[PDB]
């Protein structure tokens, strides 16, 4: 269950989304490590390489035993995600833990942003579909006219005075 | 929270998404690249809601996973079964300029719903002969011993 978040944080109507993909363990194989930020109009990807990632985690003081996805999940829980964009290049700050980590995001071509967007639409669809029952399990457990001259009011006989 | 369903709802990788918003009221089925919308007129909307509100019925159908889809390359017909009787809706393609803000808004809404749902789930020289540098530190001969 890869974490994700939307900015601005909280229940405020957001404009951006940040997420991660892959990270499958157990019977399956360890996939890639990609964190994408998009606003349904322009995607941004890490486009990192294993040597670049190793150098980045060595310079910032991390080791190979600390995965970044749990830190992203903790920041999502604490709402500690920030995005800075200059014109098309984004840098996300992850301040969930004691030290704020900085990650650099590059531009994404359209022929990759659009397929990613149309895959992520169904991705979030199935995610929310599963999370519905997940939260359920977690929380729950002529009349009026004289016939002689129709068009003239029907006449009743005179009665006069009758004491009661 | 407005209801939503994934077609098919099984463990198979989903392909189609259906949603409602507004309660001209329209029903949207999005393949993330193409959108089918009712675009019904107010008189037609009144006639359809009289013959069958639709949001509670749609929500019940989503919970019961009773939404049927029939599509032929331009046309969408939905069988909604969440109320007293089955609901039949006719949907057609919407232009791309109309769907682009719609798809952006639905993407943002899905993302924020997922984040809110996750939040609610959370709250629940060595070796060298120095005399001649460049040569191994010699060992004086020892001969034979007894072991």
Curated annotation (Swiss-Prot), chain B:
Changing residue 116 to A: Does not affect interaction with the DNA-bound XRCC5/Ku80 and XRCC6/Ku70 heterodimer. GO terms for biological process: DNA damage response; double-strand break repair via nonhomologous end joining. Phosphorylation may inhibit interaction with the DNA-bound XRCC5/Ku80 and XRCC6/Ku70 heterodimer (Ku complex). Residues 125-147 are annotated as: Mediates interaction with XRCC5/Ku80 and XRCC6/Ku70 and association with the non-homologous end joining core complex. The keyword Coiled coil does not apply. The N-terminus (residues 1-113) forms a head domain that is structurally related to those of XRCC4, XLF/NHEJ1, and SASS6. This is Protein PAXX. It comes from Homo sapiens.
